[PDB]
Amino acid sequence: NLNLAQKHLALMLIPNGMPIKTYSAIKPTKERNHPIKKIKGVESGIDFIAPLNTPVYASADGIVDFVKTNSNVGYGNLVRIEHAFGFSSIYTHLDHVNVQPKSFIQKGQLIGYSGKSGNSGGEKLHYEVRFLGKILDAQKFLAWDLDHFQSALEENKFIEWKNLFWVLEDIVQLQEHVDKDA
C-alpha cells in the first residue's frame, strides 16, 4: 500500500485519465484499418468516437516532442508528448493543434481539438500510451485514478511498478522537513 503523495505525484507524471471528455464509444484501433499499415489487427492503442472539435487534453505533465499540422494522411494532425519515466502519449486525427514542439506541458492543458484528419475512418481521437516506445493497453491508463489506483499497475509486462514507486518514494520523502547533517 502506497501513501497519498506517491499516488498524487504518479498521477501528475504518468499518463492517466480521459484525454477527451465527450465521446460516444471507445474501441481498440486493432479493430479497424490501421492509419499507417492500412490493415486490421495491429496492436496500436485506442479510438474515441467523438464529435469534431472536441477539446483534447494532455494526460500528464511533459514536453511536446513532435507535432504534425496541415496533414491529411496516415495519423493526420497529431501531438506527441514525452512524459517522465519513459512514458509517452500520442493524440491523432486532430482538426487543430494548439501546442508547439519543445513546449513544456501541464496535465490537463489543452493541446488540440479532435477531428477526422488522415486515415481516420470518420470523426475520432486516436490515442496511444507507450513506455520506451512500446505500445501499452491505454484502457488501463484511462481507468486509472486516485480511487482506482490498481488499474495501470496491471500493465506490468515491461514495467516494474514497485521499482517506480520506490523512486517516487525518494521524491515524496522530501516534503518532510529534513535532513543530511554530518
Binding site: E82, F85, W166, I171
Partner: protein
C-alpha cells in the same frame, strides 16, 4: 525552500563521481565532460529517471553506455564504463549506483565521459555539475537557453 531539493531530484546536477564532489565542496569535450578516474570507480545518477538504454557494446566509440531519461526533456549519458549494473527500463533514484567507470570503447586512458542533453541536444555539463544547493541560481544564470520560467512553474505545481 522545499522547491530546491525537489527540483534537484528531477533535473541533473552535481558530479556523477564521488571524489569530484568531495573536491568541489575535468576537461570539456566537443561535447560533454571527461573525468579521468581509475577503472571501477562507482558512477551515480545525477537525477531520478528511467534507464533509457544500458548498451554493452561499441556504441560509436562510447564503449559501454548508459542513457538515463529524466523528467521534462533532460537526459544524461554515462560512457566508457567497465560494467553496467542496471537494465534498460529500470527506474533509478538521484544518487543511485548505475555502473563502474572504465576504459571501454574509443578511449585514450581510463575516464568517465558524461553528457547532459535537453531534447537530444547537447548542453554544457559544467553548468549542471557546478549546480548545487549552495550555488542554486547557477544553472539559471549560466544556461539561459532553457525556458526555466515555464519549467519551474510546472515543477512547483507538482509539489501541490
Amino acid at each position: 525552500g522545499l522547491q530546491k531539493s525537489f527540483i534537484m531530484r528531477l533535473i541533473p546536477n552535481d558530479y556523477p563521481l564521488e571524489s569530484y564532489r568531495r573536491v568541489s565542496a575535468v576537461l570539456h569535450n566537443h561535447t560533454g565532460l571527461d573525468l579521468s578516474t581509475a577503472i571501477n570507480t562507482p558512477v551515480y545518477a545525477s537525477a531520478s529517471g528511467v534507464v533509457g538504454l544500458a548498451s554493452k557494446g561499441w556504441n560509436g566509440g562510447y564503449g559501454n553506455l548508459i542513457k538515463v531519461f529524466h523528467p521534462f526533456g533532460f537526459k544524461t549519458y554515462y560512457a566508457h564504463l567497465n560494467k553496467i549494473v542496471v537494465k534498460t527500463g529500470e527506474f533509478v533514484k538521484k544518487g543511485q549506483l548505475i555502473g563502474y567507470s572504465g576504459n571501454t570503447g574509443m578511449s585514450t586512458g581510463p575516464h568517465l565521459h558524461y553528457e547532459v542533453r535537453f531534447l537530444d541536444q547537447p548542453i554544457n555539463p559544467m553548468s549542471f555539475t557546478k549546480w548545487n544547493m549552495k550555488d542554486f541560481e547557477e544553472v539559471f544564470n549560466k544556461e539561459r537557453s532553457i525556458r526555466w520560467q515555464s519549467l519551474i512553474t510546472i515543477i512547483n505545481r507538482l509539489m501541490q
